[PDB]
Amino acid sequence: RPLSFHEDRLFPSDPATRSYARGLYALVKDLPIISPHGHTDPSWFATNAPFQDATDLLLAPDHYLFRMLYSQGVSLDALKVRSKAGVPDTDPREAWRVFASHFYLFRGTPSWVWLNHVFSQVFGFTEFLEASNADDYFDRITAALATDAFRPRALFDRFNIETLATTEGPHESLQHHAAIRESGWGGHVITAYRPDAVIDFEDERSPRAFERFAETSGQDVYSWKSYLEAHRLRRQAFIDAGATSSDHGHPTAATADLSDVEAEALFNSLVKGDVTPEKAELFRAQMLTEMAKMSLDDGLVMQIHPGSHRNHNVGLLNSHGRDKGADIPMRTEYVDALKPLLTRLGNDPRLSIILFTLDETTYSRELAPLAGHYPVLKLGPSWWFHDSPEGMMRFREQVTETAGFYNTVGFNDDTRAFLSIPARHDVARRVDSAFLARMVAEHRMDLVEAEELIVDLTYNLPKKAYKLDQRPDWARPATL
Amino acid sequence: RPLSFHEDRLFPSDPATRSYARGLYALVKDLPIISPHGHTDPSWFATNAPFQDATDLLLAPDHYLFRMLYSQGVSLDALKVRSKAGVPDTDPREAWRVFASHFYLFRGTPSWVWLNHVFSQVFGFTEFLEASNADDYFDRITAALATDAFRPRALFDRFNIETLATTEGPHESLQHHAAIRESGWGGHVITAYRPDAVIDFEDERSPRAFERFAETSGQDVYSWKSYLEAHRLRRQAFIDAGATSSDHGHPTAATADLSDVEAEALFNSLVKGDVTPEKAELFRAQMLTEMAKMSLDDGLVMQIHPGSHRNHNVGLLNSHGRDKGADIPMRTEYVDALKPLLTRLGNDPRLSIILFTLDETTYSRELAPLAGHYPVLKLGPSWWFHDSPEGMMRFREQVTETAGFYNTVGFNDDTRAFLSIPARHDVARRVDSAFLARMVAEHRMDLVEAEELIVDLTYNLPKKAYKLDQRPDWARPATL
Amino acid sequence: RPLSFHEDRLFPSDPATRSYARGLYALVKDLPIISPHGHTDPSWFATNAPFQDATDLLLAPDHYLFRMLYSQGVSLDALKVRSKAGVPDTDPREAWRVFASHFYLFRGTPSWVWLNHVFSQVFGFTEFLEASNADDYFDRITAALATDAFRPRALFDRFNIETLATTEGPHESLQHHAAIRESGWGGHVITAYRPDAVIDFEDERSPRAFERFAETSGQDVYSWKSYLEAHRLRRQAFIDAGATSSDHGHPTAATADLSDVEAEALFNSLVKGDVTPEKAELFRAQMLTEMAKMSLDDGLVMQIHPGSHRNHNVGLLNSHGRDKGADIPMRTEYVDALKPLLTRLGNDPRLSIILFTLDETTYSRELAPLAGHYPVLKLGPSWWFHDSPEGMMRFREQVTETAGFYNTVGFNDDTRAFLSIPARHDVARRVDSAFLARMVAEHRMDLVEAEELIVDLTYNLPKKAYKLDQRPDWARPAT
Ligand SMILES: [K+]
Ligand SMILES: [K+]
Ligand SMILES: [K+]
Secondary structure, three states: OEOOOOOOOOOOOOHHHHHHHHHHHHOOOOOOEEEOOOOOOOHHHHHOOOOOOOHHHHHOOOHHHHHHHHHOOOOOHHHOOOEOOEOOOOOHHHHHHHHHHOHHHHOOOHHHHHHHHHHHHHOOOOEOOOOOOHHHHHHHHHHHHOOHHHOHHHHHHHOOEEEEEEEEOOOOOOHHHHHHHHOOOOOOEEEEEOOHHHOOOOOOOHHHHHHHHHHHHOOOOOOHHHHHHHHHHHHHHHHOOOOOEEEEOOOOOOOOOOOHHHHHHHHHHHHHOOOOHHHHHHHHHHHHHHHHHHHHHHOOEEEEOOOEEOOOOHHHHHHOOOOOOOOEEOOOOOOOOOHHHHHHHOOOOOOOEEEOOOOOOHHHHHHHHHHOOOOOEEEOOOOHHHOOHHHHHHHHHHHHHHHOOOOEOOOOOOOOOHHHHHHHHHHHHHHHHHHHHHHHHOOOOOHHHHHHHHHHHHHHHHHHHOOOOOOOOOOOOOOO | OEOOOOOOOOOOOOHHHHHHHHHHHHOOOOOOEEEOOOOOOOHHHHHOOOOOOHHHHHHOOOHHHHHHHHOOOOOOOOOOOOOOOOOOOOOHHHHHHHHHHOHHHHOOOHHHHHHHHHHHHHOOOOEOOOOOOHHHHHHHHHHHHOOHHHOHHHHHHHOOEEEEEOOEOOOOOOHHHHHHHHOOOOOEEEOOEOHHHHOOOOOOOHHHHHHHHHHHHOOOOOOHHHHHHHHHHHHHHHHHOOOOEEEEOOOOOOOOOOOHHHHHHHHHHHHHOOOOHHHHHHHHHHHHHHHHHHHHHHOOEEEEOOOEEOOOOHHHHHHOOOOOOOOEEOOOOOOOOOHHHHHHHOOOOOOOEEEOOOOOOHHHHHHHHHHOOOOOEEEOOOOHHHOOHHHHHHHHHHHHHHHOOOOEOOOOOOOOOHHHHHHHHHHHHHHHHHHHHHHHHOOOOOHHHHHHHHHHHHHHHHHHHOOOOOOOOOOOOOOO | OEOOOOOOOOOOOOHHHHHHHHHHHHOOOOOOEEEOOOOOOOHHHHHOOOOOOHHHHHHOOOHHHHHHHHOOOOOOOOOOOOEOOEOOOOOHHHHHHHHHHOHHHHOOOHHHHHHHHHHHHHHOOOEOOOOOOHHHHHHHHHHHHOOHHHOHHHHHHHOOEEEEEOOEOOOOOOHHHHHHHHOOOOOOEEOOEOOOOOOOOOOOOHHHHHHHHHHHHOOOOOOHHHHHHHHHHHHHHHHHOOOOEEEEOOOOOOOOOOOHHHHHHHHHHHHHOOOOHHHHHHHHHHHHHHHHHHHHHHOOEEEEOOOEEOOOOHHHHHHOOOOOOOOEEOOOOOOOOOHHHHHHHOOOOOOOEEEOOOOOOHHHHHHHHHHOOOOOEEEOOOOHHHOOHHHHHHHHHHHHHHHOOOOEOOOOOOOOOHHHHHHHHHHHHHHHHHHHHHHHHOOOOOHHHHHHHHHHHHHHHHHHHOOOOOOOOOOOOOO
C-alpha cells in the first residue's frame, strides 16, 4: 500500500477556500522554524552524536505514541520504554514490529500526519507502514541515522531551525549549552527557566532538587532572602546562555500577593517539613508573582502552563516514573486565579505573560477577555492534546473574536521528538492558512490583511513575544 | 406540502466531501443494527401483542416529544401522558391533533429527522404532518398497527436488528427474556444489569427495591456480605439471560476504594436509616468499584452514565413521577473522580469500562486523555441531548485526536421508541460517514482507512466492546 | 487601499449553501429593526442635539474598541476616554489618529465588520482606514454630524428602527422618555427596569442609589415591606414610559425561596451594615424571585444577565470607574441555581424569563435542556463577547437541537454605539441565514421551513417575547 502524502493536506475541501489557503501557505512554507518552547535534549547538539535505532528515536521517547499502545493492552517493556529499573531487554527491531502492527490505531489522530510527514519527507519512504513492511522501515532508518546527514546539527541545519529552546531547571547545569556556543556551529540553541522542582514542595523530587540548587547558585537556599537571590543568580546564568523565557508548570493558575514577611513565614513552614496541600498551593501562587517581580528586572518572558494532573496512573509512577503519558488535564480557572498578580503588575509595560491552557472552555470565556484587556497578558497556542489540527482551529475560532491575532504568540512544537519538529510546524502553518482563508472566503477579512497575518503569525509575532529580535554574537545571523 | 426525505441528508454540502460520504455510507447502510444499550420493553417480543395508537406508540411514551410541547404551554393530560393517577381521559385522536398542530416546534431538532424517517420509510407517508393532515396520519398509522407486518417480532426482523438489549434492575424478573428464548423466534433480545435502585439510598423507590431484591435473590439483603452475594447471583441470572453489560446512572462519576470493614460500616449506617448526602455518595462510589471487582470474575462490561440531575421539576415529580423530561445535565468530573478505581484496577486486562457524559466539555479535556491511556477505559457515543447530528459530530471532532477510533464503542440508540431504532442508527451512519469524508477530503486520512473504519464503527467495534462475538444457540446465527 | 465591503459577507463559501443564505437574507434584510435591550441615551432623541466628534461618537464611548488598544499599551487619556477626573485634555483629532494607526488590531474581530459597515454604508467611505487616511476620516464624519441627516431622530427614522429599549434604574427619573412621548416625533423609544444598584449591597454606589430610590418612590426604602412597594411603584412608572422588560445583571444566576419573614430578617441585616458575601448573594438570589412575583401582576418580562466579574482591573476602577472594559466572564451555573425559583413558579403561564450567558459551555448542557422544558424559560441571543459571527453560530449549533427556535428570543444589540445598530442587526440576519442555509443544504430542514423561520427569528419572535404587539398611541404605527 502506497504512502500518499497530499500537497494540499489540512486545507478545507471547498475549492474557493482551498485556493486562498494554498496561496497563504505558499508565503510561509519555507520560512525558518522558530521554536521558543520545547523539551529536546541540548546534549544532542553538544556532542553531535548519532541516534541509534528507529525505536530509540521515534518510539521509546515519545509518549504520544506509547500512550495509544498502552491504552490497547501493550506493555511498556514490549516497546523498550525506559523504566525506573532501566531500559528493557526487548529487541529494538521487535519493539518496532509491535508499533508497526498497531500503527492503524493512529488513524485520524495528529500522529498520523506528523509521522507520515517524517516518513515521506525526511526519510523518503514510498510505502505505508504495516507489519509486512516493518523490518524494511526499521533497518532503512537505522541505516539513515548512521549517515553524516542525520547528525543532530546537520538535521538542525536541514530543517531550517532559526531558534530552538530547551527547558532546564535551576538545579541542573548548563554545560551542554556552553558547548553549543563555544563550538563554532552557530546554531541558536537556547534554554528556558523552569523552577518547578524547587517551587513545588509536593514534588517527590523536591528535596534533591533543593540540594543541587544550592550547589549551582552557591547560596543558602533554605533561608528565604537567599532562596530568592539564588533564583536571581540562576536566572542571569540562563540569560547568559541566551534564555529569553521562563516556564511554570503548576497544577493551578493561582497567584498571590503576600508581604515579604508573609511569604518568608510560609517558606519557613514548608522547608521545616510541615507541607499541607493548602500551603504548597499558596507558595506556588506566591512564587508566580515572585517570578514576575524578577521579570520586571531581568526581562524574562513568563510562560504559565497550568492544569495538568501529573502522574494520574499511580502504579505506573512506581514502576516507570514521570512523563509516561499519564498526565491528565483538569478544569482550570483564570479570572479569580490571576487577579492578585494582575492587581499588582497587570498594567506594567516591563512585564510579559503568556497564558496556556489544557482546558479549551476557558478560551472564549476567560483567556480571550483577559488577554484582550491586560497589557501584560498574551495567549499561547493550543497545547499538548490540543496541538492537533482540530484543536488549533478551535483556538482560532474561539480566541480571535475578543483577543485578536496580535494578542497571541504564534506556535511552539513543545516536543522531545526532534524529527517531528518540521512536521509539527508545517501543520501549524497549514491550519493557520485554512483559518485565514475561510475569513477571506466569507469576506470577514481582505486578502491583503490575510497575507500580512500568516507571515506575522508564523514568524514576526513569535519573535517579538519571545524577544528573539536580538540575536547573540555566537549564533548565526537571521536570514530568509 | 410534500414529505421530501432526501437521499443525501446529513452529508456535508461540499460536493467532493459529500460524494466520499455517500460512498462510505453505502458500504454500511444495510448492515444489521447492533443495539447494545436501550430501554425497549422485553414483553413486547415475548407476547407479540400489537401496538394500539399513533399516540400510544409515538407521542405518549416519548419524553423528547412532550418536553418541547410542555415547554410551549401544552399540558401532559392533553397528550395522554401517563400520570401517577394513570392514563388521562383525553381522546388519543385529540392528543395526536395537538402534537400535529405543534409539529413545527421540532424544526432543526434531531426529532425532525427521526420522525420523518419513521413517517416516510416505515409507514410510507407522502405528505408532511400538519394540523389539516393530522387525522389522516392518525388512522392510517392505527390501521397499519393492526396488520401482521407491524407486530413487534415482525418489525424486529424487517428492521434487520441483530442484537437488541433492554435494561432491568436486580429486583425485577427476567420473565419476558426467558419467554423470548424459549419461543421458535430467533431474535437476540438480551438484557443489561442496572443496580441503581438498590445502590442509591437517596432514591425514593429504594426500600421497595431492596425488598423485592431479597425475593429475587433469596438472600439477606440488609447485611453486607450477602448483599454482595445477592448482586453476584443476580448478575449471573442476567448473564444466563444473555447480558454482556452492566449500567450505572449515578449523579457523579465518583469511585472509592474502601476496605471491607469500611464498606460494611458505611453500608450499615445507611441500612439503619442515617442517609446523609455524603454517605449516599460514598456508597454509590464504593459500589462502582465493587461492580468492577465482580466484573473481574463474570466479565460484565461496565457502562457509567453519570451527571444527570433527575426530577428537576419537583411539581412534575409529585403529579407524574420519574422520566417525564425534567432530567437536566450537570457539570461532571472524571479525573479525580475515577482515580480510586483506576489506581486499584486501571491496568487490569479483565476489566472493561465504557464512559459516557452529558457534559461535552469533558470530551477533549478529560475523557479522551483518560481513554487514550488506560487499558480498561473506552468512550461511549454522545448521549441523550447530544445524541444528534451536531452532537455526534462534536464528539468525533473532540475525541478522535487523543482517543482514536478504537477507544470508542460505536453507537447505541438508548431509546424506548422502537420504531425510531432504524431512524437513529441511520443518523449515526450518515454523520460518521460525513466525518470520515472530511478526513479524506482534507487528506487527513486515506480512503482505504475510511472504508475500513466505517464498517468497524458500525458493526465490528460495537460487537468486540460488548463481547457480542459469541451468539447463543437460542438466537439466530448472524448473517449480513 | 479600497473599502471593499462584499454583498455576500458572512455567508459560507460553499456555493450551494451561499445561494440559500442569500435568498433567506433577501427575505429579511429590509425588515424594521427591533431593539428590545440596549444602553443608548434617551436624552439623545429627547433633545435631538447633534453628536460632536468622530472620537466622541465612535471611539470614546465604545469599550470593545478601547479594550483592544489598552491591551496593546495605549493609554485611555490618549483616546479621550472619560476618567473619574472628567474628559482628558487630548485633541479628538489626535485621539482618532492613534485609533487609525491601531485599526489593524481589529482584523478577525466583529469590530471589523461593524465599523466598516458604518464607514461604507452610513458614511459612504471608499478607502480603508489607515494612519495616512486618519485626518480625512475624522473631519469628513465630523462635518457629516453637523448636518440635519445625522441628527439622532433623523438617524432613528433612516435606520428603520421600530422599537428601541434603553436601560434605567428605579432611582433615576424618566424625564427624557416623557419628552419623547409628548413631542410630535413618533419614535418608539421605551425603557427597561434595571434594579441592580438597589439590590446588590456589595455595590459601592448602592447607599447613594438607595437615597434617590426613596426620592423617586416616596417610600421608606430602608424597611422591607415599603422597599417592595417602592419597587412596585417604580415598575409602574416604567410601564407608563412603555417598558415591557426588566433586566438583572447579577454575578450569579442564583435564586431563592425564603419566607416573607426570613427575607425581611436578611434585608434588615444588610440595611444595618452587616454585609457579608453570603448574605449579599442570598439577597440578590431572593430579589430575583421577588421580581418574578411582581412580574406575575404587572406582566414585565424578566431578563437574567448573569456571570460578569465586573471591575476586574482594580487600579482602573479607582482611576476611571465602571464600564471601562474590564468586566470578565466567569463559569456560570443554572441547574441548581434557578431551581428554587422554578419550583415555585416554573409552570406559571403569566411568567416570562429570558436567560442569557457569558459561558458558552452551558448552552447544550444546561440552558437548552432547561428552556426546552420549562414553560417560563427562554434563551436570549449570544451576549457581549459572543455577539459575533462565530459566537452566534456556536449559539445556534448548540441550542437548537434541544430547545428549538421557538424557545429563543431573537436578537438584541446591547450597545451604546447608536450608529452600530443597523450593522449589528445586519450581522445577526446574515448569520441566521447562514445557519438555516446549512440546514437546508444538508436536508435537515425544508426551504419552506427556513423561509418562515428567518422572518420569525428577525421580527415575529422578538415582538411576541418582549410583548411588543400593542403599540402605544404616542408612537407611530408599525409598518
Ligand atoms: K482504552
Ligand atoms: K420554554
Ligand atoms: K494583551
